Amino acid sequence: ASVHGTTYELLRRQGIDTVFGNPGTNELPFLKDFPEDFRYILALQEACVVGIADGYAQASRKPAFINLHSAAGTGNAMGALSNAWNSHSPLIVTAGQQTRAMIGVEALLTNVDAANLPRPLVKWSYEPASAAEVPHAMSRAIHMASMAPQGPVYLSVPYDDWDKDADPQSHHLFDRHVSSSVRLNDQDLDILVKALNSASNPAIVLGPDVDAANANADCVMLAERLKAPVWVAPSAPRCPFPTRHPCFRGLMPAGIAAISQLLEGHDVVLVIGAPVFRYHQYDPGQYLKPGTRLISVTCDPLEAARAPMGDAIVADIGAMASALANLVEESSRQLPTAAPEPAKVDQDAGRLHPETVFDTLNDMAPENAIYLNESTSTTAQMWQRLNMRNPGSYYFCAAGGLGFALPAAIGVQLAEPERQVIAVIGDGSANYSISALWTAAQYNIPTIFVIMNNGTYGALRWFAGVLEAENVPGLDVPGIDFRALAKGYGVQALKADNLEQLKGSLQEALSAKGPVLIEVSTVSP
Amino acid sequence: ASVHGTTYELLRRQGIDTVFGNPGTNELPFLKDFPEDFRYILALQEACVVGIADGYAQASRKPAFINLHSAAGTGNAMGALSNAWNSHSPLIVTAGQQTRAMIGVEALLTNVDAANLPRPLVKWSYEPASAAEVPHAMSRAIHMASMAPQGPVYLSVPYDDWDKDADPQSHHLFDRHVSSSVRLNDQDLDILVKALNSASNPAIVLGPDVDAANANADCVMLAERLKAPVWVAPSAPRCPFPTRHPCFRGLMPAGIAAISQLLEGHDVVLVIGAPVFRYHQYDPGQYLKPGTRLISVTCDPLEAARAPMGDAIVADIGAMASALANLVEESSRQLPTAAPEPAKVDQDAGRLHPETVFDTLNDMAPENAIYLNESTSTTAQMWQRLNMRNPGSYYFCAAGGLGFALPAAIGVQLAEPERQVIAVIGDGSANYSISALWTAAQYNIPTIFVIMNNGTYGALRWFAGVLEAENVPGLDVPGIDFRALAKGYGVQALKADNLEQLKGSLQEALSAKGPVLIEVSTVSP
Amino acid sequence: ASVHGTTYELLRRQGIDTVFGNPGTNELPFLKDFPEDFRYILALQEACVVGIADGYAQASRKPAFINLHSAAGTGNAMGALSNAWNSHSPLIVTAGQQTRAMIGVEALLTNVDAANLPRPLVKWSYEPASAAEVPHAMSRAIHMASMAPQGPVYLSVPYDDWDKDADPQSHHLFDRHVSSSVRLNDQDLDILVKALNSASNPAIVLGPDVDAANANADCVMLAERLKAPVWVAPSAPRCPFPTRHPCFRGLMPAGIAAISQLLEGHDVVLVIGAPVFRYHQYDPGQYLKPGTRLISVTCDPLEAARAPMGDAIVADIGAMASALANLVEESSRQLPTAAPEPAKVDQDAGRLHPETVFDTLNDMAPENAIYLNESTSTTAQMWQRLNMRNPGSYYFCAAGGLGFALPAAIGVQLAEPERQVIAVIGDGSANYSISALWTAAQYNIPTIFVIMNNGTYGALRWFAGVLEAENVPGLDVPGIDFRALAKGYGVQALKADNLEQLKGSLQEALSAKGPVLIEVSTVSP
């Protein structure tokens, strides 16, 4: 067998059937004779390729396979990899290298010092020392991406390797099964359970790895048993809990002092599937107030090591959430009372308040909608105004890197064909990966894109206020016609200048058979 | 509090009380006002410092703390770090950096691009961005070294940081407890147990992480229950099983074909705490023969990813060995029969056969002796001839890097003051870290060093035979007087030119109150 | 032709005829059939191998070729590479890698992520992607080490590559000639010359790259023409000027304030072949005083970029020194007056003052002696007391990394068989690379080693005073018998407890036919 044949067999035997890519010369010998049971999803720039693959992996809860062109293609994707690292996305990033005989001279298309290029944003990065090693190296890539803590990996392959003879012993790779589905030993788990049972006022904080693990329902059971309020850890990349459940308390402010104040009076704070903590603004103070102790369950040693406070347990989130939910006592305390509905913001017949947009989405969208957020100044109101009952209902660029939501929404929609995806994206953010729209059109992936157009980088105006910064250039983005951009890439386009038009546009978008972009005129901050 | 005071408090609160070091200017502000509850162990070169710390960590089963001088000191230790990486040794390597104000100009003693220096031989490598961050960075170093899979880490600290004010919020670091003591979830563990119970001819292969976990006794119980032969995985850095137990089958040959042949007819091979596999010689063939399947339990994702065959489970070795030993059925198969005693090699009144040396050590040493091996051509015979009943009884440079055993034997002896340490070291290997002898003398650490003097790099002569290599230079090391070297560093020295003298020298060494070096004249290969 | 044959032909055609090494399994296929026109110089540990090669390269003013064993051997040499980086030593460091078929599994002896291991201490680091690329990669290594600014490079080669067929087109590599012998363009050189001619009180500062370029005599002519005082830049790795020439003003103090004070009143300061500046102690103040401007000529862009003051010209030191010496006007100012002889320090009949040792060396050594310095507390007095008339007469560890002088003195002596090498090494420093002594004995390289034995790390005691550091551990090194260590490695040993014995020992050492170690009892600091 050839390295080509053996590698595709390994991929299919490990559950991979889709290649997200933008092709190039070094990759042609990999992509030729493309297997009929695989699909290839083309995107027009590599940030888009990786964003789409990332949304697909996160929603599908399995690895996604990517093929990029050498150094330039890999480089175009590195902002996307920054998000993927923070979301623990299992991405297998492959890139083609020059033919081995031309690497030394650094011919055009040579990826120099290739394994170092995507560092430090990958778990593992490698170029094999021979063609026959390629299937083994691919096996390593698959498992490194897939083992807890999941994350992106990188494999560079010289283009002449694919036609070479494979090692017959590579067949042992095909059906390898690697598990990291582990939980704390019985003795120490009993100690933890006792501590939870004995807490007088426990609180629970959940991060993105809960949703990645589909541990949401177990966390609901855990919170109900403990009669404990539940927050989402700050800078949330996913939604780990039903947002109208009586225990839900919303998104934590991303500040040191704000969080310790919030947790004051809680004797035991159990954090599951989150870093401790992904702060954002500089809000100095106490990490925790006296009387509060913290226990973190995380899938990631790097998270456990860097937490500035608390104990930690490094284990699988799914396994730990299930064990805890089933072992803790039913507390006789009263179940927390549900948060009140948010207020309706006054809205005239002109430009839309973001609050109005979210209220209307919540009114009109199906109960199993999936939202993405890259509308950076409106995140708090989005979290308060969307009822998200189900797992996998929310995605936000995990490293804050813009250019995620537009392509990721296409990948999520591909992963979840029966759940309507609605990406709410600011006018500034929409540009970073604008060309991703084309992929939705070409493959008829019916994502809805809601562009919040206020003409400015609103979040930067806000932070400029906080940091007390005057005379900052480059904050405004006037003169972009998003309907024309959508037309450019073949996506149906609508425009909503007021509430009447917003409702009409959403009605038409929800009924449409393909992707739709709605440009919404929102109020200037 | 100062960064100095806070950092030493963090260290003591995390169980660290010993600094292995070779000092320099950048480190003086760290070492000044050295706490009276700490000890400092000086060695004369950094390979020695790290080797001693490594032996101490491996034997004590806890992290060891190291302080080296900038880039040059760190660099002198990098061969030692290669071994530490392969043995999963929890080493906290700190090095001093120039004062922050002189880093930019690259004053003498500036460690340039410091975090990159020890890569790729460390789990984590870092230089903090401010003085107040130092205690937090130290906390990260402690936990990164200590979490499974354990390994060396590196922290560089500008010398002016120590006197600066610490963050009062650093107190939250002091008592953090981080656990990776995890095992496979119940459902999947039950599946594994069933597979073991159902095997018709199981075999067990154990690696160094079994001994690191003190999982030895549980593995004995597991092997007895399953009535299974037990091998030690190739290139063994530690001994994970009693070598005269009836199930014991010895050290596996470090070859692909040799191992698959050995395992032929075994339907399920359970590997615990080893890479799959640390082959050495190139011995191409089948990874496994038809009819054999392999299941690996490893603490290290990198091991699970790169195994060319078998299933894998990434979990704590102690927790997994205990669970398996206690859950499996008692097989009604007959317990394996003990291996026969090795033959006595004919020995005249002249130079010693290595076999004679090992037989005599086995005859005379206490039953709780601890051996180290850096006699590279005699490893197979050492493994056959020493009865090692207890855990922690054997160490061999895990990456094959010479210069380990001499200093490590001093660290092991420091860790285990009641167990006589006997390091068996070739004349070639003895030189790499010869200056370590001084530390044994100065602190009166009563390690016994047995130098196997055959005048040559014997293992290289052997491999030259295998690789069919003629006219190779640099294979002979004549003209070294090891008694004089020992005298040079203050260690009592004896010489054994024949068996009578070997017995006499061992009797005197075993009775001595300090370290002793015995130069043994061994037969040329 | 084989890769082996082609690579050795490339080496000999590029002037390389000596391999400094410590062998291992991965290197056997390189070292087999070792060519009869090459020599192999064995050392017992890799810091020693590289130190010897480094001294040889620096003294010979040509590249030296090194062969080390995989990661562990490379790692043992990394402290040595820290010095080599700072001295711009042209070192070609090769290391053997596992056979390509066993790299993926990480068999014992695999150098993982090999090219990253010696970073950041090398100019170029590489592992070829195929056997046929090896000669080209070696060509790159040769030229990268040899081009200005010279420095160490690293090449890792899988052991199975050597027997493979070479590319016939590799013959084009054999006679390539690469020049960096460049100087500033005529127009701008005329401007510089004018500025020098017009200076009212110029000063000259010279660094190690002057001696590396053998630009010493041209700098003498330049200083005489300009009637300018000449200093050696701080932390000096080499001696660039005759130390009794009337213009010579000695070694600059390694402090910011000290240097600006020294240069006060000098209107133009011309620095040649030095970083600006290799400060050591933290001595904050003005980089230059008002009225002083600085012009640096350096072979190294990294030096030009990081200088905190002055203009810079990046060019070949030999070419620039020659051009300047021949173009500047003869100033009518009076030639500077020679520094007075240093005072004789009172000396009783007991332990030796370092000053006495240097005065006696100066009295007795040949006028073409070559000195090395690793006696860290006595550097200032050494510089004042040794008349060094000739180029290539002084070496000091360029990064301050101890373990340089002992092996480097052997390499220097090998390079300069007619010039008596005398290495003055502290008792502390002597241990780092003590095993290097064996190489001097084996090859009968008649280096003289003068061990300054004061029982302590004296320089650290001094800096502890400056940094105001009390209760520092690990500063004393009692109980080392250097005569026994020398005997251990086959080197004739003498001991000097007083001046009478020092003179007698030096007389015997200077007359000896082999290497000699003299242990000198020096006064405690």
Ligand SMILES: Cc1ncc(C[n+]2csc(CCOP(=O)(O)OP(=O)(O)O)c2C)c(N)n1
């Ligand atoms: C790739 C990238 N570039 C720049 C930024 C910085 N950034 C953060 S928020 C923001 C503004 C985004 O504006 P928009 O999408 O219109 O949303 P708004 O803030 O107006 O709600 C920018 C530019 C970033 N996070 N990522």
Ligand SMILES: Cc1ncc(C[n+]2csc(CCOP(=O)(O)OP(=O)(O)O)c2C)c(N)n1
């Ligand atoms: C730091 C380092 N340098 C070189 C080697 C290569 N090497 C492997 S075995 C060996 C010979 C050791 O000789 P000795 O200790 O006398 O034992 P013998 O082989 O004679 O039994 C050498 C040099 C190595 N493994 N590590």
Ligand SMILES: Cc1ncc(C[n+]2csc(CCOP(=O)(O)OP(=O)(O)O)c2C)c(N)n1
């Ligand atoms: C590899 C390395 N380790 C540690 C140091 C720090 N250091 C600088 S000077 C010094 C003392 C050397 O003592 P010795 O050679 O006896 O000379 P003395 O200072 O007594 O004159 C030390 C340990 C260093 N520069 N390099």
Ligand SMILES: [Ca+2]
């Ligand atoms: Ca509503």
Ligand SMILES: [Ca+2]
């Ligand atoms: Ca906006």
Ligand SMILES: [Ca+2]
């Ligand atoms: Ca016996």
Ligand SMILES: [Ca+2]
């Ligand atoms: Ca030997």
Ligand SMILES: [Ca+2]
């Ligand atoms: Ca004199």
Ligand SMILES: [Ca+2]
């Ligand atoms: Ca000294």
Ligand SMILES: [Cl-]
């Ligand atoms: Cl358990």
Ligand SMILES: [Cl-]
């Ligand atoms: Cl479970």
Ligand SMILES: [Cl-]
């Ligand atoms: Cl010109």
Ligand SMILES: [Mg+2]
């Ligand atoms: Mg990079």
Ligand SMILES: [Mg+2]
């Ligand atoms: Mg490195």
